[PDB]
Amino acid sequence: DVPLTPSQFAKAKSENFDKKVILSNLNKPHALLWGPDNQIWLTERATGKILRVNPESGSVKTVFQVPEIVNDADGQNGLLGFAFHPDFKNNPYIYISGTFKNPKPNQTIIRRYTYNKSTDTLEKPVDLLAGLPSSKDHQSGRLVIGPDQKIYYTIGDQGRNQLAYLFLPNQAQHTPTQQELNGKDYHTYMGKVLRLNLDGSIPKDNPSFNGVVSHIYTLGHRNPQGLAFTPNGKLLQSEQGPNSDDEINLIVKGGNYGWPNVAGYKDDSGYAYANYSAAANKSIKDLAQNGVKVAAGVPVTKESEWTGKNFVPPLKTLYTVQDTYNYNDPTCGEMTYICWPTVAPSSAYVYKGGKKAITGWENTLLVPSLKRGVIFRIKLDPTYSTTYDDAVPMFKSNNRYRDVIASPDGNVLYVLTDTAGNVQKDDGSVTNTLENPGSLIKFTYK
Amino acid sequence: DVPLTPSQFAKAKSENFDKKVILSNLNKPHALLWGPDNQIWLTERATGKILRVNPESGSVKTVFQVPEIVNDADGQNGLLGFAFHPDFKNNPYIYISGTFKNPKPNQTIIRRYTYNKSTDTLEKPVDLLAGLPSSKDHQSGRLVIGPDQKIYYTIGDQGRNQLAYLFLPNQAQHTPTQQELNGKDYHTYMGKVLRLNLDGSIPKDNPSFNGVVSHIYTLGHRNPQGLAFTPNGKLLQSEQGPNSDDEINLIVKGGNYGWPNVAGYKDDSGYAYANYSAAANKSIKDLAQNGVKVAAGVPVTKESEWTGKNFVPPLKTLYTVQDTYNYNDPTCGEMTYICWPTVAPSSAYVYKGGKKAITGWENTLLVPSLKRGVIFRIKLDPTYSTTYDDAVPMFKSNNRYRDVIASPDGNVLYVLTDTAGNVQKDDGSVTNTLENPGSLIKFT
Ligand SMILES: O=C(O)c1cc(C(=O)O)c2c(n1)C(=O)C(=O)c1cc(C(=O)O)[nH]c1-2
Ligand SMILES: O=C(O)c1cc(C(=O)O)c2c(n1)C(=O)C(=O)c1cc(C(=O)O)[nH]c1-2
Ligand SMILES: OC[C@H]1O[C@@H](O)[C@H](O)[C@@H](O)[C@@H]1O
Ligand SMILES: OC[C@H]1O[C@@H](O)[C@H](O)[C@@H](O)[C@@H]1O
Ligand SMILES: [Ca+2]
Ligand SMILES: [Ca+2]
Ligand SMILES: [Ca+2]
Ligand SMILES: [Ca+2]
Ligand SMILES: [Ca+2]
Ligand SMILES: [Ca+2]
């Protein structure tokens, strides 16, 4: 899709909803879920805390704090994945993923907890999968349980080929040899959607990549922070792209989503793959022109020159631009990146309506934006096979929306906002003054 | 997708198949089917003839000639739609569409015939749907019977907003009023996928548009000459775009495929909608630069400015380019268009494999190209939800490929070629010298 203008974003205020801030100053609130007890449960990435909030009173209880969660002030690491067992009433388990120190500097671990109703706390931790890659950038970490009773987990590309990890070789396209696999060497588990048994083992029916069946379900991902099943069993996803081409994807077994060789469509438009890990020397700068313009010494491959297989294009890009696009626009001052044609999608939620469903929201996907301060509504057809029209911005504000859910009746939305960061103002200019720092906000349909 | 180069087409010779011309004297062969009798049936668009060919021997019989078929030498009209009833043994009907004079100058008519095996001919014609738009351009006309036992028919935009119909207002986005339906006025039946009952009536479960349920199933199409159901009931389609953005689409009930406001993706790249019907200068010329550059006077709408509803993007474009693209390529001397970043897909065929299935052709869609002289192989995932990778060209030749099918076994392909027309040679130049004019060719 084509980028919206600052003016089109600005007018998306959603006057049809009543806003009520339930909590503020949470410490990097990250994920929220409608609980099996009909209470709002949410995580604090920074502290490892799992909070349960009473929707009516806003009353908060710190149900549990995951011990030894490692978090960097300037990183996207910490407590990430969070889900309940689908049949909680009979299988009182909570699944999480987190950044922990790797004895063998960090690792990501997927772990199960048992919820104790009588003591109201989490207990009996079991590490399902440990030794996973870890870094300060592009961790992803969305964790869901599918209709097939498997764990689906997004693990980002770790930030390789940009910023502080500029010269590390991106592994989004790499998959394990049986040897690595036998040694539980999961270094290729970057830029992937993993599928695992509820006990952490490899599903016998997982896709085969280069002759090996591992935890990988799909590959070629950058930073997929949104993952949600539809009522008919399909898997929708949102993913952060570089300077362009954030994506909405449909996740299909064994698919290759192209990163980093391809961003968005295979269109050679507005992006090219500059592999700094192959650059002549580690002294060259990243011009930050999305590979369209690069410094001498770095090998660039067009999306059309890539030779990978099973490439699956996105359903929708936010956004795609042409080679002439200016990635250095002097409107976002020293925070140029905020003016890039992206929306920085932080999650992905399948709206399921209910007895008070919101008019016209059937088969929609809600996708919160960090840098634009809106929540997008994206319509699909009734079979969730295609999108209809464009991503509609809602709830415009000077906030970084991090996650969103709806109440069972469907007439109330609950959203989380970031504690700090940059957001685009009504006039396209950049601000780090967030209206609702680290909040739990409720939007009630009038 | 990004355009291949002359050299990339040139190299798609498919030295792994054996070519053998089965028939070569055809006059504008258009559609070909694998018949319920295990013979190959094909049509001649200009003559209205329906031929049957023995796949083994190559013996051919003219089973019937549809009477009073109208065809302009310079046109795409004639006998178009052609399908068999799915339960032929018990319902020996053949469904066609054809250009006929309109007493009330032409109209398109969807008609049924009954097959008589003892006399081996067609009879008892029944007009299912008449009074459909007709013109010399963009007729489309693919006719298929779905798993729901309904007729699905593609009807083009009639060429409006280009060439001889430049100043006519494109109706791809228009739908009928309940008053037009009641009156059997089907003028809005342009640039659509229609869905009809086997008797021509309106299916009670068809989609509703602007308040009315008509034969329209989907709208916003240019020239969709390809239509094929997959084994799991999905509807794949191919469609001719203008100077760019030919499409592979997945047809979903009530979808809007964007034409003419949007070509390919809604990306504002390489196309814009210049509405000549709205220009004040009937004097205005078409610069033929795909809306990127136009003469003064004609109103232009960007893809991103369109206020459409239910817009469904293509699965794949052949091809998409940027605004810096030059639509005036010298390599193609006089026939500049041939060098345009399109492939001109004339059909769409779902490869069903079989006992001798071509290795790795599982879940593929075959798309013949007129202007490039290839057959593209397009891979989809096993649920026919997404494409995998790109369109792989095959059988490069100086021929205009018009249709393609496979034998039940899956190891032989049958293709039709045009009698005449321009085709891109191995090195980019255009030639009107076709290697196998109007033939039925088999690739083993
Ligand atoms: O392209 C951008 O302008 C932009 C902005 C942001 C952001 O505002 O945080 C992120 C990203 N990109 C991005 O690619 C990304 O992976 C990302 C992750 C996060 C996050 O806070 O977890 N923000 C962003
Ligand atoms: O863009 C092109 O270069 C190009 C070429 C051709 C062609 O070769 O005839 C057709 C088209 N476009 C086209 O848009 C189109 O609708 C069309 C129909 C036919 C036909 O012969 O039935 N050719 C073409
Ligand atoms: O450079 C723009 C943004 O790019 C993202 O890939 C990084 O994770 C963010 O830290 C950064 O602010
Ligand atoms: O102009 C290029 C081609 O464009 C198509 O839209 C027309 O149907 C063909 O007759 C024409 O040759
Ligand atoms: Ca980004
Ligand atoms: Ca991708
Ligand atoms: Ca791209
Ligand atoms: Ca064309
Ligand atoms: Ca279209
Ligand atoms: Ca377009």
PDB file of N, CA, C and O in Angstrom, chain A residues 303-356:
ATOM      1  N   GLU A 303      16.040  -7.746  -5.202  1.00  0.00           N
ATOM      2  CA  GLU A 303      15.094  -8.795  -4.798  1.00  0.00           C
ATOM      3  C   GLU A 303      14.912  -9.801  -5.940  1.00  0.00           C
ATOM      4  O   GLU A 303      14.847 -11.004  -5.705  1.00  0.00           O
ATOM      5  N   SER A 304      14.941  -9.271  -7.161  1.00  0.00           N
ATOM      6  CA  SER A 304      14.761 -10.133  -8.339  1.00  0.00           C
ATOM      7  C   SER A 304      15.941 -11.044  -8.598  1.00  0.00           C
ATOM      8  O   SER A 304      15.805 -12.017  -9.351  1.00  0.00           O
ATOM      9  N   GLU A 305      17.113 -10.812  -8.002  1.00  0.00           N
ATOM     10  CA  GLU A 305      18.281 -11.656  -8.248  1.00  0.00           C
ATOM     11  C   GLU A 305      18.406 -12.768  -7.220  1.00  0.00           C
ATOM     12  O   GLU A 305      19.192 -13.705  -7.398  1.00  0.00           O
ATOM     13  N   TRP A 306      17.598 -12.737  -6.162  1.00  0.00           N
ATOM     14  CA  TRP A 306      17.615 -13.778  -5.140  1.00  0.00           C
ATOM     15  C   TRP A 306      17.235 -15.136  -5.722  1.00  0.00           C
ATOM     16  O   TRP A 306      16.255 -15.198  -6.467  1.00  0.00           O
ATOM     17  N   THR A 307      17.923 -16.198  -5.305  1.00  0.00           N
ATOM     18  CA  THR A 307      17.567 -17.528  -5.792  1.00  0.00           C
ATOM     19  C   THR A 307      16.913 -18.445  -4.776  1.00  0.00           C
ATOM     20  O   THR A 307      17.005 -19.669  -4.953  1.00  0.00           O
ATOM     21  N   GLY A 308      16.216 -17.947  -3.766  1.00  0.00           N
ATOM     22  CA  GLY A 308      15.553 -18.824  -2.801  1.00  0.00           C
ATOM     23  C   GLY A 308      14.260 -19.403  -3.364  1.00  0.00           C
ATOM     24  O   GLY A 308      13.762 -18.964  -4.395  1.00  0.00           O
ATOM     25  N   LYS A 309      13.672 -20.350  -2.664  1.00  0.00           N
ATOM     26  CA  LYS A 309      12.482 -21.080  -3.079  1.00  0.00           C
ATOM     27  C   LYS A 309      11.367 -20.975  -2.054  1.00  0.00           C
ATOM     28  O   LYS A 309      11.588 -20.680  -0.878  1.00  0.00           O
ATOM     29  N   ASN A 310      10.146 -21.248  -2.484  1.00  0.00           N
ATOM     30  CA  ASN A 310       8.940 -21.171  -1.686  1.00  0.00           C
ATOM     31  C   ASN A 310       8.707 -19.767  -1.139  1.00  0.00           C
ATOM     32  O   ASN A 310       8.165 -19.616  -0.041  1.00  0.00           O
ATOM     33  N   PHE A 311       9.012 -18.749  -1.944  1.00  0.00           N
ATOM     34  CA  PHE A 311       8.780 -17.369  -1.546  1.00  0.00           C
ATOM     35  C   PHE A 311       7.292 -17.039  -1.526  1.00  0.00           C
ATOM     36  O   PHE A 311       6.558 -17.233  -2.500  1.00  0.00           O
ATOM     37  N   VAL A 312       6.845 -16.567  -0.365  1.00  0.00           N
ATOM     38  CA  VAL A 312       5.460 -16.186  -0.133  1.00  0.00           C
ATOM     39  C   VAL A 312       5.391 -14.684   0.115  1.00  0.00           C
ATOM     40  O   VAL A 312       6.001 -14.175   1.069  1.00  0.00           O
ATOM     41  N   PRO A 313       4.696 -13.954  -0.741  1.00  0.00           N
ATOM     42  CA  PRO A 313       4.546 -12.515  -0.614  1.00  0.00           C
ATOM     43  C   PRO A 313       3.524 -12.142   0.434  1.00  0.00           C
ATOM     44  O   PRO A 313       2.618 -12.913   0.755  1.00  0.00           O
ATOM     45  N   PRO A 314       3.626 -10.933   0.974  1.00  0.00           N
ATOM     46  CA  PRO A 314       2.680 -10.446   1.961  1.00  0.00           C
ATOM     47  C   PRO A 314       1.286 -10.204   1.396  1.00  0.00           C
ATOM     48  O   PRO A 314       1.168  -9.865   0.207  1.00  0.00           O
ATOM     49  N   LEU A 315       0.261 -10.232   2.238  1.00  0.00           N
ATOM     50  CA  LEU A 315      -1.077  -9.823   1.827  1.00  0.00           C
ATOM     51  C   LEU A 315      -1.127  -8.307   1.692  1.00  0.00           C
ATOM     52  O   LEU A 315      -1.902  -7.757   0.910  1.00  0.00           O
ATOM     53  N   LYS A 316      -0.393  -7.606   2.574  1.00  0.00           N
ATOM     54  CA  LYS A 316      -0.423  -6.142   2.514  1.00  0.00           C
ATOM     55  C   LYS A 316       0.893  -5.556   3.037  1.00  0.00           C
ATOM     56  O   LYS A 316       1.556  -6.183   3.872  1.00  0.00           O
ATOM     57  N   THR A 317       1.366  -4.500   2.390  1.00  0.00           N
ATOM     58  CA  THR A 317       2.580  -3.823   2.825  1.00  0.00           C
ATOM     59  C   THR A 317       2.234  -2.412   3.310  1.00  0.00           C
ATOM     60  O   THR A 317       1.448  -1.671   2.707  1.00  0.00           O
ATOM     61  N   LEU A 318       2.928  -2.018   4.371  1.00  0.00           N
ATOM     62  CA  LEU A 318       2.750  -0.698   4.969  1.00  0.00           C
ATOM     63  C   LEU A 318       4.130  -0.118   5.269  1.00  0.00           C
ATOM     64  O   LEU A 318       4.595  -0.212   6.414  1.00  0.00           O
ATOM     65  N   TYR A 319       4.810   0.433   4.280  1.00  0.00           N
ATOM     66  CA  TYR A 319       4.257   0.662   2.947  1.00  0.00           C
ATOM     67  C   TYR A 319       5.276   0.357   1.856  1.00  0.00           C
ATOM     68  O   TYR A 319       6.467   0.167   2.127  1.00  0.00           O
ATOM     69  N   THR A 320       4.858   0.368   0.583  1.00  0.00           N
ATOM     70  CA  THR A 320       5.811   0.152  -0.507  1.00  0.00           C
ATOM     71  C   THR A 320       6.001   1.476  -1.245  1.00  0.00           C
ATOM     72  O   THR A 320       5.051   2.238  -1.424  1.00  0.00           O
ATOM     73  N   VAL A 321       7.237   1.818  -1.554  1.00  0.00           N
ATOM     74  CA  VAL A 321       7.519   3.074  -2.249  1.00  0.00           C
ATOM     75  C   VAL A 321       8.494   2.802  -3.380  1.00  0.00           C
ATOM     76  O   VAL A 321       9.064   1.706  -3.421  1.00  0.00           O
ATOM     77  N   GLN A 322       8.744   3.791  -4.227  1.00  0.00           N
ATOM     78  CA  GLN A 322       9.652   3.598  -5.353  1.00  0.00           C
ATOM     79  C   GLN A 322      11.086   3.986  -5.034  1.00  0.00           C
ATOM     80  O   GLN A 322      11.357   4.564  -3.977  1.00  0.00           O
ATOM     81  N   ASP A 323      12.011   3.641  -5.922  1.00  0.00           N
ATOM     82  CA  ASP A 323      13.430   3.881  -5.712  1.00  0.00           C
ATOM     83  C   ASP A 323      13.757   5.351  -5.487  1.00  0.00           C
ATOM     84  O   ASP A 323      14.785   5.669  -4.884  1.00  0.00           O
ATOM     85  N   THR A 324      12.954   6.243  -6.044  1.00  0.00           N
ATOM     86  CA  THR A 324      13.181   7.670  -5.922  1.00  0.00           C
ATOM     87  C   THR A 324      12.761   8.199  -4.556  1.00  0.00           C
ATOM     88  O   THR A 324      12.953   9.391  -4.321  1.00  0.00           O
ATOM     89  N   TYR A 325      12.157   7.367  -3.717  1.00  0.00           N
ATOM     90  CA  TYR A 325      11.706   7.844  -2.412  1.00  0.00           C
ATOM     91  C   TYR A 325      12.878   8.435  -1.626  1.00  0.00           C
ATOM     92  O   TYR A 325      13.981   7.893  -1.671  1.00  0.00           O
ATOM     93  N   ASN A 326      12.620   9.506  -0.885  1.00  0.00           N
ATOM     94  CA  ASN A 326      13.674  10.150  -0.086  1.00  0.00           C
ATOM     95  C   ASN A 326      13.665   9.625   1.346  1.00  0.00           C
ATOM     96  O   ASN A 326      12.744   9.931   2.100  1.00  0.00           O
ATOM     97  N   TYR A 327      14.651   8.815   1.702  1.00  0.00           N
ATOM     98  CA  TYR A 327      14.715   8.249   3.043  1.00  0.00           C
ATOM     99  C   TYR A 327      15.343   9.225   4.036  1.00  0.00           C
ATOM    100  O   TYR A 327      15.433   8.920   5.225  1.00  0.00           O
ATOM    101  N   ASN A 328      15.705  10.416   3.573  1.00  0.00           N
ATOM    102  CA  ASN A 328      16.245  11.451   4.452  1.00  0.00           C
ATOM    103  C   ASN A 328      15.454  12.746   4.274  1.00  0.00           C
ATOM    104  O   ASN A 328      15.851  13.695   3.604  1.00  0.00           O
ATOM    105  N   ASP A 329      14.287  12.752   4.897  1.00  0.00           N
ATOM    106  CA  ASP A 329      13.336  13.860   4.817  1.00  0.00           C
ATOM    107  C   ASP A 329      13.475  14.774   6.024  1.00  0.00           C
ATOM    108  O   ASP A 329      13.218  14.357   7.155  1.00  0.00           O
ATOM    109  N   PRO A 330      13.894  16.012   5.800  1.00  0.00           N
ATOM    110  CA  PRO A 330      14.107  16.980   6.857  1.00  0.00           C
ATOM    111  C   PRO A 330      12.829  17.560   7.429  1.00  0.00           C
ATOM    112  O   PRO A 330      12.588  18.769   7.391  1.00  0.00           O
ATOM    113  N   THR A 331      11.987  16.699   7.972  1.00  0.00           N
ATOM    114  CA  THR A 331      10.733  17.092   8.605  1.00  0.00           C
ATOM    115  C   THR A 331      10.699  16.402   9.971  1.00  0.00           C
ATOM    116  O   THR A 331      10.145  16.878  10.954  1.00  0.00           O
ATOM    117  N   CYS A 332      11.384  15.262  10.009  1.00  0.00           N
ATOM    118  CA  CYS A 332      11.504  14.455  11.215  1.00  0.00           C
ATOM    119  C   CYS A 332      12.813  14.764  11.932  1.00  0.00           C
ATOM    120  O   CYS A 332      13.316  14.000  12.752  1.00  0.00           O
ATOM    121  N   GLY A 333      13.361  15.940  11.632  1.00  0.00           N
ATOM    122  CA  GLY A 333      14.577  16.437  12.235  1.00  0.00           C
ATOM    123  C   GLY A 333      15.689  15.409  12.336  1.00  0.00           C
ATOM    124  O   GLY A 333      16.139  14.823  11.351  1.00  0.00           O
ATOM    125  N   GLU A 334      16.169  15.207  13.558  1.00  0.00           N
ATOM    126  CA  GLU A 334      17.254  14.275  13.827  1.00  0.00           C
ATOM    127  C   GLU A 334      16.716  12.850  13.949  1.00  0.00           C
ATOM    128  O   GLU A 334      17.474  11.911  14.189  1.00  0.00           O
ATOM    129  N   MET A 335      15.400  12.705  13.849  1.00  0.00           N
ATOM    130  CA  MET A 335      14.770  11.390  13.979  1.00  0.00           C
ATOM    131  C   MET A 335      14.178  10.952  12.645  1.00  0.00           C
ATOM    132  O   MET A 335      13.035  10.529  12.523  1.00  0.00           O
ATOM    133  N   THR A 336      14.999  11.099  11.616  1.00  0.00           N
ATOM    134  CA  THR A 336      14.672  10.797  10.235  1.00  0.00           C
ATOM    135  C   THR A 336      13.788   9.568  10.084  1.00  0.00           C
ATOM    136  O   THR A 336      12.761   9.618   9.413  1.00  0.00           O
ATOM    137  N   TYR A 337      14.166   8.482  10.744  1.00  0.00           N
ATOM    138  CA  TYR A 337      13.484   7.206  10.611  1.00  0.00           C
ATOM    139  C   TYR A 337      11.982   7.295  10.830  1.00  0.00           C
ATOM    140  O   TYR A 337      11.229   6.480  10.284  1.00  0.00           O
ATOM    141  N   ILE A 338      11.543   8.249  11.649  1.00  0.00           N
ATOM    142  CA  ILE A 338      10.105   8.360  11.923  1.00  0.00           C
ATOM    143  C   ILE A 338       9.342   8.727  10.658  1.00  0.00           C
ATOM    144  O   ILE A 338       8.157   8.400  10.525  1.00  0.00           O
ATOM    145  N   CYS A 339      10.004   9.361   9.695  1.00  0.00           N
ATOM    146  CA  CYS A 339       9.374   9.749   8.441  1.00  0.00           C
ATOM    147  C   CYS A 339       9.441   8.651   7.381  1.00  0.00           C
ATOM    148  O   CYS A 339       8.886   8.806   6.286  1.00  0.00           O
ATOM    149  N   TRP A 340      10.106   7.548   7.701  1.00  0.00           N
ATOM    150  CA  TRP A 340      10.179   6.420   6.777  1.00  0.00           C
ATOM    151  C   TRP A 340       8.779   5.863   6.535  1.00  0.00           C
ATOM    152  O   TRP A 340       7.916   5.896   7.409  1.00  0.00           O
ATOM    153  N   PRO A 341       8.551   5.342   5.332  1.00  0.00           N
ATOM    154  CA  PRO A 341       7.271   4.767   4.957  1.00  0.00           C
ATOM    155  C   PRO A 341       7.020   3.412   5.597  1.00  0.00           C
ATOM    156  O   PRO A 341       6.913   2.369   4.937  1.00  0.00           O
ATOM    157  N   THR A 342       6.863   3.417   6.913  1.00  0.00           N
ATOM    158  CA  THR A 342       6.558   2.249   7.719  1.00  0.00           C
ATOM    159  C   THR A 342       5.589   2.672   8.826  1.00  0.00           C
ATOM    160  O   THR A 342       5.386   3.879   9.017  1.00  0.00           O
ATOM    161  N   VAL A 343       4.992   1.713   9.512  1.00  0.00           N
ATOM    162  CA  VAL A 343       4.097   2.054  10.612  1.00  0.00           C
ATOM    163  C   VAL A 343       4.559   1.367  11.898  1.00  0.00           C
ATOM    164  O   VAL A 343       3.979   1.627  12.950  1.00  0.00           O
ATOM    165  N   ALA A 344       5.539   0.476  11.789  1.00  0.00           N
ATOM    166  CA  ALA A 344       6.034  -0.233  12.976  1.00  0.00           C
ATOM    167  C   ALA A 344       4.939  -0.952  13.736  1.00  0.00           C
ATOM    168  O   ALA A 344       4.548  -0.601  14.863  1.00  0.00           O
ATOM    169  N   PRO A 345       4.392  -2.020  13.140  1.00  0.00           N
ATOM    170  CA  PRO A 345       3.346  -2.824  13.727  1.00  0.00           C
ATOM    171  C   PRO A 345       3.915  -3.631  14.887  1.00  0.00           C
ATOM    172  O   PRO A 345       4.930  -4.305  14.754  1.00  0.00           O
ATOM    173  N   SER A 346       3.231  -3.569  16.028  1.00  0.00           N
ATOM    174  CA  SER A 346       3.751  -4.200  17.243  1.00  0.00           C
ATOM    175  C   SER A 346       3.008  -5.443  17.646  1.00  0.00           C
ATOM    176  O   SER A 346       3.425  -6.142  18.579  1.00  0.00           O
ATOM    177  N   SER A 347       1.857  -5.709  17.017  1.00  0.00           N
ATOM    178  CA  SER A 347       1.097  -6.913  17.350  1.00  0.00           C
ATOM    179  C   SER A 347       0.121  -7.218  16.183  1.00  0.00           C
ATOM    180  O   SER A 347       0.179  -6.563  15.134  1.00  0.00           O
ATOM    181  N   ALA A 348      -0.814  -8.119  16.420  1.00  0.00           N
ATOM    182  CA  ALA A 348      -1.822  -8.463  15.402  1.00  0.00           C
ATOM    183  C   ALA A 348      -2.946  -9.205  16.110  1.00  0.00           C
ATOM    184  O   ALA A 348      -2.689 -10.232  16.746  1.00  0.00           O
ATOM    185  N   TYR A 349      -4.154  -8.671  16.057  1.00  0.00           N
ATOM    186  CA  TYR A 349      -5.256  -9.283  16.794  1.00  0.00           C
ATOM    187  C   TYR A 349      -6.469  -9.549  15.903  1.00  0.00           C
ATOM    188  O   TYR A 349      -6.963  -8.636  15.258  1.00  0.00           O
ATOM    189  N   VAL A 350      -6.962 -10.780  15.944  1.00  0.00           N
ATOM    190  CA  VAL A 350      -8.156 -11.129  15.163  1.00  0.00           C
ATOM    191  C   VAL A 350      -9.409 -10.793  15.953  1.00  0.00           C
ATOM    192  O   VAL A 350      -9.720 -11.456  16.945  1.00  0.00           O
ATOM    193  N   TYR A 351     -10.136  -9.787  15.491  1.00  0.00           N
ATOM    194  CA  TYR A 351     -11.345  -9.336  16.166  1.00  0.00           C
ATOM    195  C   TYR A 351     -12.459 -10.357  15.994  1.00  0.00           C
ATOM    196  O   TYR A 351     -12.831 -10.606  14.842  1.00  0.00           O
ATOM    197  N   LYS A 352     -12.986 -10.921  17.080  1.00  0.00           N
ATOM    198  CA  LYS A 352     -13.998 -11.960  16.936  1.00  0.00           C
ATOM    199  C   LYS A 352     -15.410 -11.516  17.263  1.00  0.00           C
ATOM    200  O   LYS A 352     -16.282 -12.376  17.429  1.00  0.00           O
ATOM    201  N   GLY A 353     -15.673 -10.221  17.338  1.00  0.00           N
ATOM    202  CA  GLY A 353     -17.006  -9.721  17.654  1.00  0.00           C
ATOM    203  C   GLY A 353     -17.538 -10.268  18.974  1.00  0.00           C
ATOM    204  O   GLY A 353     -16.804 -10.451  19.947  1.00  0.00           O
ATOM    205  N   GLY A 354     -18.813 -10.633  18.985  1.00  0.00           N
ATOM    206  CA  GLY A 354     -19.487 -11.130  20.186  1.00  0.00           C
ATOM    207  C   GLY A 354     -20.881 -10.501  20.267  1.00  0.00           C
ATOM    208  O   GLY A 354     -21.251  -9.727  19.377  1.00  0.00           O
ATOM    209  N   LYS A 355     -21.584 -10.711  21.381  1.00  0.00           N
ATOM    210  CA  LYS A 355     -22.952 -10.210  21.481  1.00  0.00           C
ATOM    211  C   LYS A 355     -23.037  -8.704  21.310  1.00  0.00           C
ATOM    212  O   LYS A 355     -24.110  -8.210  20.935  1.00  0.00           O
ATOM    213  N   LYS A 356     -21.954  -7.959  21.514  1.00  0.00           N
ATOM    214  CA  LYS A 356     -22.009  -6.516  21.267  1.00  0.00           C
ATOM    215  C   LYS A 356     -20.993  -6.119  20.202  1.00  0.00           C
ATOM    216  O   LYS A 356     -20.389  -5.049  20.274  1.00  0.00           O
TER     217      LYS A 356
END
